[PDB]
């Protein structure tokens, strides 16, 4: 069973351009390890940037959408939930780790989600505020990466731990 | 209608004991102002409170459970959402204010959602990471209470406009 | 608590006019009964008619419905769940028995639904082929109604076991 | 893109072993026809078969579970979805074809909800009063097939359409 790696992060128009760079790179470096990407489908900020990068360096890629799907063709693999818009909803369960690539209520409400699944997220390009609040909530489970190496570190970690 | 009040907060193990007073009290004066109170309908920290604190006040309760079967009496109308609880649902789409009583991942979910939805919150006994980090995301939908009756007079004041 | 009557049945396109009379007819005696109804709270077949009658009745009304904006005065108590409307949601494991007015692949879906999570169902004004196959599935639960006045005896002998 | 073929049955107890093995057979053609298979992860009646039948032919597989995922080893990607055992939650908005093995109340709903969602469905394994039934619901969308051969021809065609 390949590894599954969540990507979440803030769509277009809240995204700072180190946080496309830096998802595209993370996608890439998903990708070239061997792992599934998994995030969501839509095709605009963050998520779309790590599924381009995923897909260009020959990773497989799963596209979570709610309805009818008219999804970049980064997406190999979209499954579509039927849900709302609320999220964000909510399959990085099915994640072995989360990497949050900036952060906005979307993006902090499934990083929340997946600490109350027990499961280790780690946060890039996302700011103190966040950082703090999170590592409060389980300090065990939250790493902050400083870039995108630091990123996949820690991810590399928490699998060979499982 | 009447307005409909929800209340999110931390389970029986981690709500602290001050938290427990405040929720009760929360529930009690929704209920003394005449609103519905919304809250999770299964868990026993800050919702029970709520609940139990609604309900003494003669205040009309809707409870949002996962399912079957593991219901208080103090619940009114149990809305059984058979979804998991991966998330609490709670429902606060349904409600028009939503009120945070501590704070923990499953709050802190919840919280972000009805943010994520426009909707105000009004954090009460949340530590001051919570509230600079909410208010970090949408300082325009965010009140940071300071005990139950700021939070109630927040909840007043959204209520009005 | 007063027994929750869960509704179910097509929407304003495949709701009959004889359904339609029907959905109004049930929501009425629902509420003169003291039974909650629970329906859609978007949906203008059945869902709406039932509503409407209850509330004419001078019941109460829990109206289910996906999302904002798009309600009714007839709805008592908004539930908005933020799922899709790939599914009728509403929530009839809420209900303590549910009630299919006319029939259609939403309807045949919560129907089938409640049966897995075995719920009695009472079928009124579907045909032939929806009361034989969901017969298949469970002959224990479901229960066919000739008109309103059985299906509301059906409920009433399902409410007092 | 590879298309994504759905299966649905009932689990283990309520379950002929004509459709364990219609089941496993259908798997194997859903994988060697190059399609992926999506169904529930949970390892037990005509889903699992399926899995199986996908995995022993080279197919790649999709396995739906709700929770904690303590899941056969033929499920490659598990979609963790976090809803209730109430389905069945329901992500073959995501299949292009849906195909019932057998029949009972979880299937009926899934059915349905891609009859909803304008979705055709295959019915191989199903009794006369399902199969009238759905076909009453929409005929366009309704495809019996008297064994897995005509179930894999169905799904065949309604691809070439699409």
Chains 1, 4 share one sequence.
Do not use: Y
């Not at 109350?116 to 300090?139: C, I, N, R, Y």
């Amino acid at each position: 069973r390949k590894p599954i790696i969540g990507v979440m992060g803030p769509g277009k128009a809240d995204t700072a351009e180190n946080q496309l760079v830096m998802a595209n790179e993370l996608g890439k470096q998903i990708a070239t390890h061997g792992w599934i990407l998994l995030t969501g489908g839509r095709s605009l900020g963050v998520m779309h940037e790590a599924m381009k990068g995923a897909k260009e360096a020959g990773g497989t890629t799963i596209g979570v959408l709610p309805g009818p799907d008219t999804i970049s063709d980064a997406v190999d693999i979209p499954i579509v939930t039927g849900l709302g818009s609320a999220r964000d909803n909510i399959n990085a369960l099915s994640s072995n780790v989360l990497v949050a690539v900036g952060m906005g209520p979307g993006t902090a409400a499934e990083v929340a989600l997946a600490l109350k699944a027990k499961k280790p997220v780690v946060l890039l390009g996302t700011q103190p505020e966040a950082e703090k609040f999170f590592t409060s909530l389980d300090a065990g489970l939250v790493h902050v990466a400083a870039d995108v190496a630091g990123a996949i570190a820690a991810v590399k970690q928490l699998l060979a731990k499982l």
